[PDB]
């Protein structure tokens, strides 16, 4: 029936004709090469260097499972041509995610801002929600750092993802998001760190 | 041969239906199993396949730049959706009774045969005159006042999504 063969390529498991008339091969390659990026993602986003890179890596798996959820759900056994047409409006989007990642890659703020410029570049198209849901969770830990100088004042650093690192007492070196609030955060914290010693 | 053709009309060429970079899809030569009179209707049928291939090749290539070109291709797949869906159906009808000939298959396309041709030169004017910027929202509109009802109902969809970009930017500025 061959449908359980083609449908089991989007998952990654090899098959009798998927290793690792006669024109079907051309049709097969159009759904085949879709699979080669799905596997090329789990090889790239499997780990749980940078903290913000982990969250973006943790946000990606929040999406692939949906792609694994949509498959193996609707079709028990459908027509061969139905598969190619059904997975077109969705398959091409999977190949777009290869242009985003590698399959080098920035980290820290350099990545949290690079992903932002990917929004305005392709805003109105159908790639707005998926990129947004990534950016909405790829900035989750970075807000916590920002949520320190505003509430508690205990600066938290791990590898340098923060744009700011650590008589005169004012040597916390400082030097996208609106600069109208950038420089203000730098002073909104040092005041708290100064009242803690008084 | 039926399922062979329904792939050739999808964008996959083979031995029976060779592909040429200049002319387009066409039958190679006479075949003994089939009749020598069908060698014509297929060539009349491929004049449609060549359109879809040259469509999807351009759609993927994205080529020139600008959002209004990105969105045009984004919408260009929507009008092209009933073509695919109506092609998946042909296989189902042939799966039921095995007495259907190419005549019925040629008959099923009907609407797509008189639509693609008029929506082919709209693409050609873009790639041949470097239509950059919002000027697309007129070049597509000047062809939206066409007489053919099917076309008048196709381009209007593309203009209906291409306006979504301006409506996005316009509200973002005002």
């Amino acid at each position: 029936e061959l449908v359980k063969d083609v449908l089991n390529v989007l998952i990654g498991v090899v098959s009798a004709t998927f290793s690792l008339p006669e024109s079907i091969s051309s049709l097969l390659s159009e759904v085949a090469e879709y699979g080669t990026c799905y596997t090329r993602l789990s090889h790239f986003s499997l780990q749980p260097k940078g903290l913000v890179f982990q969250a973006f890596t943790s946000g990606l798996r929040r999406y692939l499972q949906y792609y694994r959820a949509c498959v193996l759900s609707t079709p028990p056994t459908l027509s061969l041509l139905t598969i190619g047409f059904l997975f077109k409006k969705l398959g091409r989007q999977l190949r777009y995610l290869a242009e985003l990642c590698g399959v080098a890659f920035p980290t820290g703020v350099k990545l949290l801002s690079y992903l932002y410029q990917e929004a305005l570049h392709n805003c109105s198209n159908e790639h707005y929600p998926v990129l947004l849901s990534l950016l909405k969770t790829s900035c989750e830990p970075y807000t916590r750092f920002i949520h320190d100088w505003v509430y508690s004042g205990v600066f938290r650093d791990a590898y340098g993802e923060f744009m700011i690192q650590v008589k005169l007492y004012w040597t916390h070196g400082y030097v996208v998001f609106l600069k109208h609030i950038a420089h203000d955060i730098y002073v909104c914290g040092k005041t708290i760190n100064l009242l803690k010693l008084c | 041969m039926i399922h062979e053709l329904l792939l050739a009309l999808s964008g996959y060429p083979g031995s029976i239906f060779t592909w040429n970079k200049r002319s387009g899809l066409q039958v190679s030569q006479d075949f003994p199993f089939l009749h020598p009179s069908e060698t014509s209707v297929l060539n009349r049928l491929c004049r449609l396949g060549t359109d879809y291939i040259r469509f999807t090749e351009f759609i993927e290539q994205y080529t020139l730049h600008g959002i209004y070109l990105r969105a045009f291709c984004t919408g260009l797949d929507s009008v092209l959706q009933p073509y695919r869906q109506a092609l998946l159906d042909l296989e189902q009808e042939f799966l039921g009774d095995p007495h259907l000939s190419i005549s019925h298959v040629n008959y099923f396309l009907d609407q797509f045969q008189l639509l693609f041709p008029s929506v082919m030169v709209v693409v050609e004017q873009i790639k041949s005159q470097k239509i950059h910027g919002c000027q697309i929202l007129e070049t597509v509109y000047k062809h939206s006042c066409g007489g053919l009802p099917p076309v008048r109902s196709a381009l209007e969809k593309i203009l209906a999504v291409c306006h979504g970009v301006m409506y996005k930017q316009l509200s973002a500025w005002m």
Binding site: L120, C123, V150, I181, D184, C188 | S171
Partner: peptide, 19 residues
């Protein structure tokens, strides 16, 4: 539209009170 209001709104309300 990219209007960053979910960040600055719970933020500017606290900056003026500290200063």
């Amino acid at each position: 539209v990219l209007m960053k209001r979910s960040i600055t709104a719970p933020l500017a309300a606290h900056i003026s009170l500290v200063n």
